[PDB]
Design a protein around this ligand. Structure first.
Ligand SMILES: [Mg+2]
Ligand SMILES: [Mg+2]
Ligand SMILES: [Mg+2]
Ligand SMILES: [Mg+2]
Ligand SMILES: [Mg+2]
Ligand SMILES: [Mg+2]
Ligand SMILES: [Mg+2]
Ligand SMILES: [Mg+2]
Ligand SMILES: [Mg+2]
Ligand SMILES: [Mg+2]
Ligand SMILES: [Mg+2]
Ligand SMILES: [Mg+2]
Ligand SMILES: [Mg+2]
Ligand SMILES: [Mg+2]
Ligand SMILES: [Mg+2]
Ligand SMILES: [Mg+2]
Ligand SMILES: [Mg+2]
Ligand SMILES: [Mg+2]
Ligand SMILES: [Mg+2]
Ligand SMILES: [Mg+2]
Ligand SMILES: [Mg+2]
Ligand SMILES: [Mg+2]
Ligand SMILES: [Mg+2]
Ligand SMILES: [Mg+2]
Ligand SMILES: [Mg+2]
Ligand SMILES: [Mg+2]
Ligand SMILES: [Mg+2]
Ligand SMILES: [Mg+2]
Ligand SMILES: [Mg+2]
Ligand SMILES: [Mg+2]
Ligand SMILES: [Mg+2]
Ligand SMILES: [Mg+2]
Ligand SMILES: [Mg+2]
Ligand SMILES: [Mg+2]
Ligand SMILES: [Mg+2]
Ligand SMILES: [Mg+2]
Ligand SMILES: [Mg+2]
Ligand SMILES: [Mg+2]
Ligand SMILES: [Mg+2]
Ligand SMILES: [Mg+2]
Ligand SMILES: [Mg+2]
Ligand SMILES: [Mg+2]
Ligand SMILES: [Mg+2]
Ligand SMILES: [Mg+2]
Ligand SMILES: [Mg+2]
Ligand SMILES: [Mg+2]
Ligand SMILES: [Mg+2]
Ligand SMILES: [Mg+2]
Ligand SMILES: [Mg+2]
Ligand SMILES: [Mg+2]
Ligand SMILES: [Mg+2]
Ligand SMILES: [Mg+2]
Ligand SMILES: [Mg+2]
Ligand SMILES: [Mg+2]
Ligand SMILES: [Mg+2]
Ligand SMILES: [Mg+2]
Ligand SMILES: [Mg+2]
Ligand SMILES: [Mg+2]
Ligand SMILES: [Mg+2]
Ligand SMILES: [Mg+2]
Ligand SMILES: [Mg+2]
Ligand SMILES: [Mg+2]
Ligand SMILES: [Mg+2]
Ligand SMILES: [Mg+2]
Ligand SMILES: [Mg+2]
Ligand SMILES: [Mg+2]
Ligand SMILES: [Mg+2]
Ligand SMILES: [Mg+2]
Ligand SMILES: [Mg+2]
Ligand SMILES: [Mg+2]
Ligand SMILES: [Mg+2]
Ligand SMILES: [Mg+2]
Ligand SMILES: [Mg+2]
Ligand SMILES: [Mg+2]
Ligand SMILES: [Mg+2]
Ligand SMILES: [Mg+2]
Ligand SMILES: [Mg+2]
Ligand SMILES: [Mg+2]
Ligand SMILES: [Mg+2]
Ligand SMILES: [Mg+2]
Ligand SMILES: [Mg+2]
Ligand SMILES: [Mg+2]
Ligand SMILES: [Mg+2]
Ligand SMILES: [Mg+2]
Ligand SMILES: [Mg+2]
Ligand SMILES: [Mg+2]
Ligand SMILES: [Mg+2]
Ligand SMILES: [Mg+2]
Ligand SMILES: [Mg+2]
Ligand SMILES: [Mg+2]
Ligand SMILES: [Mg+2]
Ligand SMILES: [Mg+2]
Ligand SMILES: [Mg+2]
Ligand SMILES: [Mg+2]
Ligand SMILES: [Mg+2]
Ligand SMILES: [Mg+2]
Ligand SMILES: [Mg+2]
Ligand SMILES: [Mg+2]
Ligand SMILES: [Mg+2]
Ligand SMILES: [Mg+2]
Ligand SMILES: [Mg+2]
Ligand SMILES: [Mg+2]
Ligand SMILES: [Mg+2]
Ligand SMILES: [Mg+2]
Ligand SMILES: [Mg+2]
Ligand SMILES: [Mg+2]
Ligand SMILES: [Mg+2]
Ligand SMILES: [Mg+2]
Ligand SMILES: [Mg+2]
Ligand SMILES: [Mg+2]
Ligand SMILES: [Mg+2]
Ligand SMILES: [Mg+2]
Ligand SMILES: [Mg+2]
Ligand SMILES: [Mg+2]
Ligand SMILES: [Mg+2]
Ligand SMILES: [Mg+2]
Ligand SMILES: [Mg+2]
Ligand SMILES: [Mg+2]
Ligand SMILES: [Mg+2]
Ligand SMILES: [Mg+2]
Ligand SMILES: [Mg+2]
Ligand SMILES: [Mg+2]
Ligand SMILES: [Mg+2]
Ligand SMILES: [Mg+2]
Ligand SMILES: [Mg+2]
Ligand SMILES: [Mg+2]
Ligand SMILES: [Mg+2]
Ligand SMILES: [Mg+2]
Ligand SMILES: [Mg+2]
Ligand SMILES: [Mg+2]
Ligand SMILES: [Mg+2]
Ligand SMILES: [Mg+2]
Ligand SMILES: [Mg+2]
Ligand SMILES: [Mg+2]
Ligand SMILES: [Mg+2]
Ligand SMILES: [Mg+2]
Ligand SMILES: [Mg+2]
Ligand SMILES: [Mg+2]
Ligand SMILES: [Mg+2]
Ligand SMILES: [Mg+2]
Ligand SMILES: [Mg+2]
Ligand SMILES: [Mg+2]
Ligand SMILES: [Mg+2]
Ligand SMILES: [Mg+2]
Ligand SMILES: [Mg+2]
Ligand SMILES: [Mg+2]
Ligand SMILES: [Mg+2]
Ligand SMILES: [Mg+2]
Ligand SMILES: [Mg+2]
Ligand SMILES: [Mg+2]
Ligand SMILES: [Mg+2]
Ligand SMILES: [Mg+2]
Ligand SMILES: [Mg+2]
Ligand SMILES: [Mg+2]
Ligand SMILES: [Mg+2]
Ligand SMILES: [Mg+2]
Ligand SMILES: [Mg+2]
Ligand SMILES: [Mg+2]
Ligand SMILES: [Mg+2]
Ligand SMILES: [Mg+2]
Ligand SMILES: [Mg+2]
Ligand SMILES: [Mg+2]
Ligand SMILES: [Mg+2]
Ligand SMILES: [Mg+2]
Ligand SMILES: [Mg+2]
Ligand SMILES: [Mg+2]
Ligand SMILES: [Mg+2]
Ligand SMILES: [Mg+2]
Ligand SMILES: [Mg+2]
Ligand SMILES: [Mg+2]
Ligand SMILES: [Mg+2]
Ligand SMILES: [Mg+2]
Ligand SMILES: [Mg+2]
Ligand SMILES: [Zn+2]
Lengths: 122, 118, 59, 131, 204
RNA sequence: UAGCGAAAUUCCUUGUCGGGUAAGUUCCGACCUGCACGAAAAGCGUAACGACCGGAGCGCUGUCUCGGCGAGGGACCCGG
RNA sequence: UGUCGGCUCGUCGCAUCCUGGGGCUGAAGAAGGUCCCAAGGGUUGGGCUGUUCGCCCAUUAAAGCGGCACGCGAGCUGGGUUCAGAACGUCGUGAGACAGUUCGGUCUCUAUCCGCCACGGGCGCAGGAGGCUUGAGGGGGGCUCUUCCUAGUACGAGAGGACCGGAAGGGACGCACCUCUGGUUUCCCAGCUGUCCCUCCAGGGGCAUAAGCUGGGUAGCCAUGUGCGGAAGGGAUAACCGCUGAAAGCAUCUAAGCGGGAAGCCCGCCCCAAGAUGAGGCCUCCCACGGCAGCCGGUAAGGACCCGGGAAGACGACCCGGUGGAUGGGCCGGGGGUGUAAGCGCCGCGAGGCGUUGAGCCGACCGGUCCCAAUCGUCCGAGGUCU
């Protein structure tokens, strides 16, 4: 359940470290964004000389949340951090790698390049 | 809403209600029959019946459990030696409550009597 | 709160019409099947001490 | 009528019994059936069970594991037809029923606070000897 | 337009095609007809149904004669299904088949005197910043001298619950003739053990 | 005059430039066209101090998204 | 007759921001421009500043304009402004002054009437009753986006890119629900500190909150969780488009007549509803009781009182039960929560550990069982007006 002001850990090699949600791209007035949702976010912390810098307004896609995500099979899944991955306007991952596991819902929502770059899809 | 919530509050907080049930259990297990208001009467039954059945069990664990609520060692000895045996074949219903005719003058409280079965 | 207050003195008609539901209902009594004394049902007879056909209380 | 009997009766067809018992603290490998694209495989989930809810057929248990530096929790229904098998890999002894606190402990402290349950391990070895 | 009386028994979920589907279990059948409403005798078409057998000692003479006219044992509940006419004299769960879409009607759980926030989902007030004793109050209710009154039907505080509620287009997950059971997918108004009516859906 | 200046003073005014912010009529740093600072009704600075008045951050939160449940004393019923 | 702005709560207008239906276009397509019809629903979150307004950020189908004492302080707020303090600029010899700036600065427990939300009591609906109903008339609801197939086709040099028709998936909103997810769970269980006590050890109780603190947690009530709704369809139309066709040999959508045509109107859907005094309909039950359209009295069908109670509930109402009985309490079984009780044995100098032992305890949930408590009863209650 990511909403505006929520801090996300970036799980790629774009140079960013923490972004902050500022909008959920999902209709005119969505309240929360879960796994597989594209958001607009302001970069709040980055390593030097990266692909992006602090203050950059980028679009990301959430890959794991601290809220649990319910699945039709009756089961659920929950992670220890709310994490996102920066993307471009063509849903492509801007970085070259992703770190940590990502959720399987992404495969349903057309993020095959992030799913392939994942070390483990859960 | 109160849907399926058991037990009364009796305009008392937790410790006050607990001590009320305890003191009435003591007074009853002593005198055999006490006069109380009808709600306190209808609520005593669970407490006293559970204690009496526990005394019917008879072992040391039951004596310590009952002594948690009763504290008085002599009263518990009386409950195990005199009161318990006369309910050896009775399964539950060790107490009874009968409504009294006339109310109370100061406040109009409807009274009742709670006594131990024969 | 700005202290609401009665606008007009209530007419005797209106106050008595409001009180139209104040009448007491008389008690509910039955004869005790031992001393035939009138007493509330489901209570122990306070004139003979009997209930359910046996002594319970000294009257 | 007995409404609880009716509920249990409707549930009866789906009740699963071939799954080995365990307690909060045991390390477990759950072989779960997973659809991805365009097939269905089996993905394993190995971790410490931190909680076991009990509601007859609606009993669900939660499993925690560190996966590549990220704490992951999965909740499974005991009578789910997607759990192919469950394998006990270690018996731990917990003084508690709910194991939430291990979300704030390091791995070392976790090993210190959930030591091996030598009793139920000896009971596991005591069986396992067929004739 | 088929229907049947029944009692909500409780909620659970089952597994169909690797999907956990929530169900309400309803004890519907059996229900015998005790009267039939015809256009020539009453003005419209309907079927009066009876549910749950009753101790005859608890039934009074008028209802007893009514039951007897149909040659039907005493029953606890009598409820009509309009625009219905089964050919037999007893309605069972067999009328509903898996996959059929239905509407279920029940009596909601009564919430008693309900605040404006529980009844009408009002926003209430601030819980700080000076808000003086109105953290749950409804606020303004009118204008001023114009119109100088309150609208009819203005959402306010009052009773809420224990009212007729109809939930529509619920899939029949399963039917169990041996136990007169009806497994529907979703939520059905009222507590476990409440009276519910199951009819065919009105939405194509 | 020195010093200071869109100021506890600047009408036009959210002046313009820079900083902070995803975005800053406030804030901080500048310029000076000071409507209408200015040197014991003191001028410009000042470590320490302030339940004084601004601005930003970290932490943490039912302040909020957005409300939910629970406790007790009233409110509700009866007697005075 | 409390004056800005906010918050809460709305409702209305339509000069329509969006969604819908159109005409003209300097309308190829896609996208716009302009005018016509349309008020059913919808119209976001944030930075600045008391602001309304406005600018800006990120979105959007869209971020409409207005009325209701510039809606709404016996609903809240009190930042602005508009008492007394203090200061700055400026004015005045001065006391003081400006609305010019700046810091601060008491907003009143009890609703009589109308109105509104809920809810009972009385009477009436010509005999009195138990049920089941019709729906006059009301309210609710009414939203929209993305992708895909059609089809990279019609159209265009190319970029770009459809009508019509057909699927799938969202956002907010509404109603219900507790299987799952997630809360609470005031004593359901365990751990821990300090002190006082029972009884010295052990084992326990009180108090540290109106749970002493911590770790958990049933039923219930709950959203963050789950199901479902917006329609489909029919009818009459608005702008607009026609058919046939005079007056007016032509022409004309019209003067006679007939089609097509909107998220709008009427029905359809859910809910209330015969106080609908126009008091409806159907099933069944009781009956011509005595004395003097009236009165008194005992009854009938029945109803109420009282009592055990209830996911019903402020009271009262509703619904269930009253020994011919499972309604509550107890007891037993199951679920469930807590997580291995006391005691004894064994190991250790000891704090403790092991075994007995998934033990002991254990509210509400699903059941069983007359052990206890609904004992015994009383009061109402038709004799059917007239053409
Ligand atoms: Mg990472
Ligand atoms: Mg920077
Ligand atoms: Mg209630
Ligand atoms: Mg409460
Ligand atoms: Mg109960
Ligand atoms: Mg209690
Ligand atoms: Mg209670
Ligand atoms: Mg009570
Ligand atoms: Mg009191
Ligand atoms: Mg008291
Ligand atoms: Mg206390
Ligand atoms: Mg106390
Ligand atoms: Mg008990
Ligand atoms: Mg009694
Ligand atoms: Mg007195
Ligand atoms: Mg009495
Ligand atoms: Mg006031
Ligand atoms: Mg008032
Ligand atoms: Mg006040
Ligand atoms: Mg008031
Ligand atoms: Mg007052
Ligand atoms: Mg007078
Ligand atoms: Mg008068
Ligand atoms: Mg009056
Ligand atoms: Mg008089
Ligand atoms: Mg005497
Ligand atoms: Mg159940
Ligand atoms: Mg059965
Ligand atoms: Mg794998
Ligand atoms: Mg691990
Ligand atoms: Mg399998
Ligand atoms: Mg019903
Ligand atoms: Mg409220
Ligand atoms: Mg509501
Ligand atoms: Mg609410
Ligand atoms: Mg609030
Ligand atoms: Mg506030
Ligand atoms: Mg205040
Ligand atoms: Mg307050
Ligand atoms: Mg208010
Ligand atoms: Mg006013
Ligand atoms: Mg008027
Ligand atoms: Mg009600
Ligand atoms: Mg099936
Ligand atoms: Mg000079
Ligand atoms: Mg300057
Ligand atoms: Mg400036
Ligand atoms: Mg200066
Ligand atoms: Mg100043
Ligand atoms: Mg000026
Ligand atoms: Mg200015
Ligand atoms: Mg200025
Ligand atoms: Mg500016
Ligand atoms: Mg400007
Ligand atoms: Mg600037
Ligand atoms: Mg900048
Ligand atoms: Mg700037
Ligand atoms: Mg400020
Ligand atoms: Mg200048
Ligand atoms: Mg000046
Ligand atoms: Mg000066
Ligand atoms: Mg001087
Ligand atoms: Mg200084
Ligand atoms: Mg100070
Ligand atoms: Mg000082
Ligand atoms: Mg902060
Ligand atoms: Mg609050
Ligand atoms: Mg509350
Ligand atoms: Mg409370
Ligand atoms: Mg209280
Ligand atoms: Mg309370
Ligand atoms: Mg009084
Ligand atoms: Mg118009
Ligand atoms: Mg339009
Ligand atoms: Mg249009
Ligand atoms: Mg146009
Ligand atoms: Mg063009
Ligand atoms: Mg076009
Ligand atoms: Mg063009
Ligand atoms: Mg036009
Ligand atoms: Mg409109
Ligand atoms: Mg509008
Ligand atoms: Mg805005
Ligand atoms: Mg702000
Ligand atoms: Mg800020
Ligand atoms: Mg603002
Ligand atoms: Mg501000
Ligand atoms: Mg402005
Ligand atoms: Mg856009
Ligand atoms: Mg458009
Ligand atoms: Mg308005
Ligand atoms: Mg004006
Ligand atoms: Mg005003
Ligand atoms: Mg306004
Ligand atoms: Mg006003
Ligand atoms: Mg106002
Ligand atoms: Mg007012
Ligand atoms: Mg005001
Ligand atoms: Mg006023
Ligand atoms: Mg305010
Ligand atoms: Mg002020
Ligand atoms: Mg100010
Ligand atoms: Mg101002
Ligand atoms: Mg002022
Ligand atoms: Mg002021
Ligand atoms: Mg002043
Ligand atoms: Mg000053
Ligand atoms: Mg001066
Ligand atoms: Mg001046
Ligand atoms: Mg002068
Ligand atoms: Mg001077
Ligand atoms: Mg002057
Ligand atoms: Mg003056
Ligand atoms: Mg102050
Ligand atoms: Mg005020
Ligand atoms: Mg006053
Ligand atoms: Mg008063
Ligand atoms: Mg009043
Ligand atoms: Mg009036
Ligand atoms: Mg009435
Ligand atoms: Mg009317
Ligand atoms: Mg109607
Ligand atoms: Mg209507
Ligand atoms: Mg194509
Ligand atoms: Mg289409
Ligand atoms: Mg849809
Ligand atoms: Mg449950
Ligand atoms: Mg739950
Ligand atoms: Mg659950
Ligand atoms: Mg839970
Ligand atoms: Mg306890
Ligand atoms: Mg000791
Ligand atoms: Mg102690
Ligand atoms: Mg003491
Ligand atoms: Mg105390
Ligand atoms: Mg305690
Ligand atoms: Mg918890
Ligand atoms: Mg707790
Ligand atoms: Mg619970
Ligand atoms: Mg929700
Ligand atoms: Mg939907
Ligand atoms: Mg038409
Ligand atoms: Mg033409
Ligand atoms: Mg023509
Ligand atoms: Mg014509
Ligand atoms: Mg036509
Ligand atoms: Mg036409
Ligand atoms: Mg046509
Ligand atoms: Mg239409
Ligand atoms: Mg629609
Ligand atoms: Mg109805
Ligand atoms: Mg009706
Ligand atoms: Mg009628
Ligand atoms: Mg009329
Ligand atoms: Mg009638
Ligand atoms: Mg009719
Ligand atoms: Mg009778
Ligand atoms: Mg009855
Ligand atoms: Mg009786
Ligand atoms: Mg009897
Ligand atoms: Mg029972
Ligand atoms: Mg029982
Ligand atoms: Mg039990
Ligand atoms: Mg058990
Ligand atoms: Mg268990
Ligand atoms: Mg042990
Ligand atoms: Mg032991
Ligand atoms: Mg030794
Ligand atoms: Mg050993
Ligand atoms: Mg048990
Ligand atoms: Mg029996
Ligand atoms: Mg008995
Ligand atoms: Mg009697
Ligand atoms: Zn007597």
């Amino acid at each position: 359940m990511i909403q505006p002001q929520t801090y996300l850990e970036v799980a790629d090699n774009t140079g960013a470290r923490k972004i902050m949600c500022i909008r959920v791209l999902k209709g005119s007035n969505a309240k929360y964004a879960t796994v597989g949702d594209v958001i607009v976010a302001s970069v709040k912390e980055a390593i030097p000389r990266g692909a992006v810098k602090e203050g950059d307004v980028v679009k990301a896609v959430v890959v794991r949340t601290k809220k649990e995500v319910k699945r039709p099979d009756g089961s659920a899944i929950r992670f220890d951090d709310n994490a996102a991955v920066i993307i471009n306007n063509q849903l492509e991952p801007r970085g070259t790698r992703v770190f940590g596991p990502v959720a399987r819902e992404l495969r349903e929502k057309g993020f095959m390049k992030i799913v392939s770059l994942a070390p483990e899809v859960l | 809403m109160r849907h399926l919530k058991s037990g009364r509050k009796l305009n008392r907080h937790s410790s006050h209600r607990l001590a009320l049930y305890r003191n009435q259990a003591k007074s009853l297990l002593t005198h055999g029959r006490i006069t109380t208001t009808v709600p306190k009467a209808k609520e005593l039954r669970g407490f006293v019946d559970h204690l009496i059945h526990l005394a019917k069990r008879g072992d040391l664990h039951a004596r310590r459990l009952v002594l948690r609520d009763l504290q008085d060692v002599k009263l518990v000895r009386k409950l195990f030696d005199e009161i318990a045996p006369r309910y050896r074949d009775r399964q539950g219903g060790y107490t009874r409550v009968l409504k009294l005719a006339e109310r109370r003058r100061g406040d109009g409280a409807p009274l009742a009597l709670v006594e131990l079965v024969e | 709160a700005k202290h609401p207050v009665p606008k007009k003195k209530t007419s005797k008609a209106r106050r008595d019409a409001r009180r139209s539901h104040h009448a007491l209902t008389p008690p509910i009594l039955v004869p005790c099947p031992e001393c035939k004394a009138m007493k509330p049902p489901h209570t122990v007879c306070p004139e003979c001490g009997y209930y359910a056909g046996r002594k319970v209380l000294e009257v | 009528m007995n409404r609880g009997a009716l509920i249990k009766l409707v549930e009866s067809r789906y009740v699963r019994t071939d799954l080995p018992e365990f307690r909060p603290g045991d390390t477990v490998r759950v072989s779960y059936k997973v659809k991805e694209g365009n097939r269905t495989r089996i993905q394993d989930f190995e971790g410490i069970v931190i909680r076991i809810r009990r509601n007859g057929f609606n009993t669900t248990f939660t499993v925690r594991k560190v996966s590549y530096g990220v704490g992951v929790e999965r909740i499974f229904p005991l009578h789910s037809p997607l759990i192919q098998k469950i394998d006990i890999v270690q018996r731990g002894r917990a003084r508690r029923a709910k194991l939430y606190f291990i979300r704030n402990l390091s791995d070392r402290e976790i090993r210190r606070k959930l030591r091996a349950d030598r009793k139920r391990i000896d009971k596991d070895r005591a069986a396992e000897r067929a004739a | 337009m088929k229907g049947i009386l029944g009692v909500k028994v409780g909620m659970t979920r089952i597994f169909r095609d690797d999907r956990a589907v929530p169900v309400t279990v309803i004890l519907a059948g059996p229900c015998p007809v005790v009267q039939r409403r015809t256009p020539e005798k009453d003005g419209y078409t309907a079927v009066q149904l009876g549910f749950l057998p009753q101790n005859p000692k608890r039934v009074n003479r008028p209802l007893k004669g009514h039951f007897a006219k149909a040659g039907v044992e005493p029953v606890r509940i009598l409820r009509e299904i309009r625009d219905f006419n089964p050919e037999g004299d007893t309605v069972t769960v067999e009328i509903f088949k898996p996959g059929e879409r239905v509407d279920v009607t029940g009596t909601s759980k009564g919430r008693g005197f309900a605040g404006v926030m529980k009844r009408w989902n009002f926003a209430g007030g601030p819980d700080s910043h000076g808000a003086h004793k109105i953290h749950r109050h409804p606020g303004s209710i009118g204008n001023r001298k114009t119109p100088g009154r309150v609208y009819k039907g203005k959402k306010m505080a009052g009773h809420y619950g224990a009212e007729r509620v109809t939930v529509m287009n619920l899939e029949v997950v399963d039917v169990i003739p041996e136990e007169n059971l009806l497994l529907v997918k979703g939520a059905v108004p009222g507590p476990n053990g409440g009276l519910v009516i199951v009819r065919e859906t009105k939405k194509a």
